[PDB]
């Protein structure tokens with residue numbers, strides 16, 4: 001349901017973020033906490049200051065996970081298996097929260113790579129982030 | 142993502158509707174048109190009277206399609222391929238409308254088989270109808 | 283929109299027939315079974331690992347009675363659903379942190395419980411009347427979200 | 429909720445910098461590209477088979493200018509967003525039959541277009557201010573839905 005062109009599109013915009021997984025990930029999280037503060041209930045133990053050690057470390061783990069997803073874009077379910085267990089079964093993250101984070105990831109690419117996030121590219125990246133979210137909410141039980 | 146037990150559950154509640162695909166399908170459609178009248182814009186050419194020939198014939202095609210889905214519950218995408226083309230690409234049905242129809246299908250089983258649509262069974266049937274809707278909205282382009 | 287006389291009649295005449303304790307227990311149990319992330323909002327009620335645990339939780343059964351009694355206060359304030367629900371809206375937002383998309387999921391479970399208990403009264407037209415009510419109540423509970 | 433002085437400042441100071449014709453054309457084109465079912469609501473604008481056709485539709489480009497000019501009238505009525513948008517809400521519901529879940533999809537595209545045109549002004553705090561605005565405007569356009 002990601003086409004071949006969608007896949008080539010995602011791989012190319014993702015290449016821009018290489019070298020920047022911590023920085024882009026930290027920013028995607030700060031934007032999620034600030035624009036959608038109801039998401040902060042999931043992170044009680046976190047220093048929420050700008051560039052806190054914790055938010056940077058978490059930004060990096062999130063984006064590294066998304067980077068692996070791009071490298072296994074033909075088998076998202078198997079590349080994201082453990083994380084689906086974690087989010088859906090152990091944390092019971094309400095599914096609406098994956099749309100916020102996905103949106104904040106788009107905003108980070110628009111700020112840093114505005115010419116590279118063209119309308120067709122935006123459409124691909126958005127399809128990839130929906131596909132990632134659907135795997136992470138697939139194990140509620 | 143439908144478990145083995147979900148699949149056995151769906152097959153058993155579906156067995157009740159056998160012999161009744163036209164009648165249950167006609168009713169699911171009349172409830173969708175009455176409770177969610179914004180769905181009627183898709184059916185301009187239809188007599189909307191109760192038990193109109195057209196609504197019965199359409200109720201039957203819909204439920205027959207859902208019956209085939211139950212019989213190929215391990216490969217929904219291939220069992221529903223043509224219908225996804227039709228809904229998403231040719232009709233451009235707004236995706237929210239699949240949630241209404243899914244809900245009205247649950248109400249029809251609750252009215253006719255209240256003891257058979259127990260809480261665990263309801264949970265299975267609901268997972269099957271989401272899975273069916275996700276295939277039918279997977280081809281927007 | 284306003285309820286017309288035919289809609290009001292369907293709503294008032296059905297609700298008089300509803301066992302609110304039983305229906306309420308049933309609707310709350312089904313939402314925690316059908317949408318399992320909702321269990322996070324009630325993790326103070328105990329045991330909610332599986333459906334068997336939920337159906338045998340006395341706290342779930344009692345809370346379900348109070349949610350449906352409160353929803354059934356809409357039926358006496360059809361004119362004023364939003365205003366009547368404003369404080370509960372505030373408590374859900376501020377105290378319980380519930381995401382407002384969830385209110386429409388419970389509205390749909392309540393329609394399924396009513397259909398299964400009163401299948402002869404829940405005609406096509408009656409269901410249309412109730413669906414409008416449940417959509418107004420979910421919107422009133424979402425309204426003080428700021 | 430009310431806008432505070434810091435939120436109002438972010439909104440007013442950014443909007444003064446926005447090219448509404450260009451941004452508006454861009455946001456409308458992106459929604460028809462990213463969410464293709466929305467093309468059904470505009471099937472009177474012509475050619476909308478693919479992204480190339482959408483970016484070269486003069487009717488899409490002009491309509492996008494008028495949608496963003498109208499959204500930008502929110503910025504002069506921060507106090508009164510719901511009241512100001514009520515007629516448009518009615519026209520969307522009655523005349524154009526648009527499903528109200530779509531309003532929040534366009535709000536998010538507008539945030540992406542603003543971010544890409546004004547990346548230095550669209551700080552974390554500014555984006556939080558705009559996100560509240562776009563959520564109030566989507567709710568005001570959904571309000572006369574009955």
Ligand code: HEM
Nearest residue numbers: 039042043061062065066083087091093097098101132136
């Ligand atoms: C693209 C979407 C997401 C990805 C790829 C993702 C990825 C991850 C990863 C890699 C971890 C760390 C797992 C580990 O260390 O073993 C994690 C933890 C976590 N995620 Fe997510 N996540 C996503 C969305 C979300 C959302 C939307 C929420 C809540 C709003 C959330 C809440 C959490 C929490 C609370 C933890 C545990 C944090 C901690 O223990 O410090 N995640 N996630």
Ligand code: HEM
Nearest residue numbers: 180183184202203206207224228232234238239242273277
């Ligand atoms: C479970 C969900 C659905 C199933 C299984 C389904 C199945 C079908 C089938 C089998 C057909 C006939 C195709 C043919 O004759 O070749 C059809 C046609 C159609 N469906 Fe659906 N459908 C579903 C949901 C919906 C929804 C939600 C809408 C709109 C609210 C919709 C609107 C239509 C329309 C307008 C047609 C063409 C009707 C006609 O030409 O007379 N369907 N669908």
Ligand code: HEM
Nearest residue numbers: 320323324345348349352353370378380384385388419423
């Ligand atoms: C028709 C929709 C709803 C109504 C009428 C309703 C009504 C109520 C009422 C009357 C209370 C008791 C509040 C008090 O004693 O002060 C309550 C508490 C609560 N509700 Fe709801 N509610 C609804 C939907 C939901 C949903 C969808 C959720 C979560 C998914 C939710 C979560 C809660 C929680 C967590 C509490 C506090 C639990 C406790 O400690 O008793 N409610 N609600």
Ligand code: HEM
Nearest residue numbers: 466469470491494495498499516524526530531534565569
């Ligand atoms: C910020 C959100 C929105 C605003 C401020 C807005 C504003 C407007 C305005 C000002 C008009 C012109 C109405 C007139 O001339 O009388 C209009 C027309 C229209 N809008 Fe929207 N709109 C928004 C969202 C949407 C969405 C999300 C859709 C569909 C997905 C939509 C579909 C339409 C349609 C079909 C028309 C009529 C098209 C035509 O013939 O010009 N709008 N809208």
